[PDB]
With several copies, the nearest count.
Chain A
Amino acid sequence: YLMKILTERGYSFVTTAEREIVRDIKEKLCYVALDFENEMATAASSSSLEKSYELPDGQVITIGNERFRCPETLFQPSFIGMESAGIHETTYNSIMKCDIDIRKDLYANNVMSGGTTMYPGIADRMQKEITALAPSTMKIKIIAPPERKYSVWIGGSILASLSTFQQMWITKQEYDEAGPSIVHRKCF
Chain B
Amino acid sequence: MILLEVNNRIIEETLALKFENAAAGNKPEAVEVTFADFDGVLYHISNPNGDKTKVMVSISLKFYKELQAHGADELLKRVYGSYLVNPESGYNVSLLYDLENLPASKDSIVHQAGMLKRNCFASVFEKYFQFQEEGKEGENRAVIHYRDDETMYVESKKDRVTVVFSTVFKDDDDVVIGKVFMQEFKEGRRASHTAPQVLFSHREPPLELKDTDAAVGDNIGYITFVLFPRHTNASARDNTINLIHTFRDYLHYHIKCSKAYIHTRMRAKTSDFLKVLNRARPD
User: A residues bordering B, Cβ < 8 Å?
Assistant: 42, 44-48, 50-52, 54, 58-60, 62, 135-137, 179
Structural contact, A47 and B206, CB atoms closer than 8 A: yes
- B271 CB-CB contact with A under 8 Å: no
- What are the residues of chain A within 8 A of B203 when measuring CB–CB? 179
Structural contact, B193 and A47, CB atoms closer than 8 A: no
- What are the residues of chain B within 8 A of A137 when measuring CB–CB? 193-194, 230
Structural contact, A45 and B197, CB atoms closer than 8 A: no
Main secondary structure of the interface of B (DSSP, over half): mixed
- B174 CB-CB contact with A under 8 Å: no
B187 to chain A, nearest CB (A): 11
A129 to chain B, nearest CB (A): 15
B228 (CB) vs chain A CBs: closest residue: A52
- B155 CB-CB contact with A under 8 Å: yes
Structural contact, B193 and A60, CB atoms closer than 8 A: yes
A51-B160, A137-B230 given; name 11 further pairs at CB < 8 Å.
A45-B207, A45-B208, A47-B164, A47-B208, A48-B157, A48-B162, A60-B194, A60-B195, A60-B230, A62-B197, A137-B194
B199 to chain A, nearest CB (A): 7
A59-B193, A135-B194 known; A46 vs B199 contact (CB < 8 Å)? yes
- What are the residues of chain A within 8 A of B193 when measuring CB–CB? 58-60, 135-137
User: B residues bordering A, Cβ < 8 Å?
Assistant: 155, 157, 159-160, 162, 164, 193-195, 197, 199, 203-204, 206-208, 224, 226, 228, 230
B159 (CB) vs chain A CBs: closest residue: A51
Structural contact, A47 and B194, CB atoms closer than 8 A: no
Listed A/B pairs (9) with beta-carbon separation below 8 Å: A45-B208, A47-B162, A47-B164, A47-B199, A47-B226, A50-B197, A135-B193, A135-B194, A136-B193
Structural contact, B206 and A45, CB atoms closer than 8 A: yes
A64 (CB) vs chain B CBs: closest residue: B197
Bound complex: CA A135 to CA B236 (Å)? 14
> In this complex, which of B159, B194, B203, B224 has the most chain A Cβ atoms within 10 angstroms of its Cβ?
B194
Bound complex: CA A98 to CA B110 (Å)? 50
Bound complex: CA A58 to CA B159 (Å)? 19
- What are the residues of chain A within 8 A of B208 when measuring CB–CB? 45, 47-48
Bound complex: CA A137 to CA B197 (Å)? 17
- What are the residues of chain A within 8 A of B206 when measuring CB–CB? 45, 47
Bound complex: CA A42 to CA B207 (Å)? 8
A177 (CB) vs chain B CBs: closest residue: B203
B241 to chain A, nearest CB (A): 18
A45-B208, A47-B206, A135-B194 known; A52 vs B199 contact (CB < 8 Å)? no
Bound complex: CA A183 to CA B28 (Å)? 71
Bound complex: CA A159 to CA B224 (Å)? 41
